[PDB]
Amino acid sequence: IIGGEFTTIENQPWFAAIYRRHRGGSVTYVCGGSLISPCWVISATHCFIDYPKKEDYIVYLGRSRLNSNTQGEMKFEVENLILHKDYSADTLAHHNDIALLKIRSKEGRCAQPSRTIQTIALPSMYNDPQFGTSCEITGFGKEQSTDYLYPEQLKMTVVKLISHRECQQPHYYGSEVTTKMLCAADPQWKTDSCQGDSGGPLVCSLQGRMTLTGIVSWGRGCALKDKPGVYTRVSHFLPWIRSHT
C-alpha cells in the first residue's frame, strides 16, 4: 500500500497472509487473501498460476506482522488450491483473477474465530456500491514503487470506486477493463495498492454490512495519475465461489 496508514489485524480480521516455501527451505510472502468461511480463503489466481502446487504454500490468519509472529495467530497448510479455469491475460489486465484456498492446520482443523480472526461477508449478486463510494484496501505490499522491501507491519488505505466509463477511457485503461472488474483510486492519486497487495480485500460498507466487494488484481505502476487499481468484481463470481466451496 502506497500512502495510507499502518494497522493491526484487529482492524481487518478476515485478512489472510499467504507465503510460499521454496527449495532452499526459505519462506517468502506471496499475496493477501480474505477468510470467507472457516475453511476457505479467497485470493487472486495470478498469485499462484506459475506455481500451482498446494504443498508449497502456508497461510496465516490473525497475523499483523510480515516476518514475526503475532500473538493469537493461526497457521495452515493448503488442503486445496483452486484456480479459476478461465484465467487469462497474465501479461497485465488479468481476467477471472480469483482463487480459493481450503485451509487445514497440522491438527486437521479450520479457522477458529477470535478477536483477530473473523470472516467477511460476500456481496449479493450484482450488488456493488455506486461509483464515488469510499472503500478500504489492506495488505503487506510495497509502500513505494521503488522499494525493495515489503513493510513489516500491515497497512490499510481508503480508495474511491471509479465508474467503468471513467476507467475505460483510453487515457485510463481502455478496453482492458471489463464488467467483471472494478477500478478504485485516490482523487489525488497519492494512495493505492502496490506489488504484494494482490489477493487482498477491497471492503466497502453496503447497507451497514462490511462486504468483500473486490480482490486486489492489477494496475499499471502504483499511485500514478490515470492508472487506478483494478479489482476482481466479487459480485460477478458468486456461482463460481458457491460451486467450488
Binding site: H46, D50, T91, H94
Partner: peptide
C-alpha cells in the same frame, strides 16, 4: 511476461 503490480510469485516476468 507479467507487467504492472499484479505479478507476484511469477517465474519471469
Amino acid at each position: 511476461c507479467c507487467l504492472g503490480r499484479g505479478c507476484e510469485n511469477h517465474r519471469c516476468l
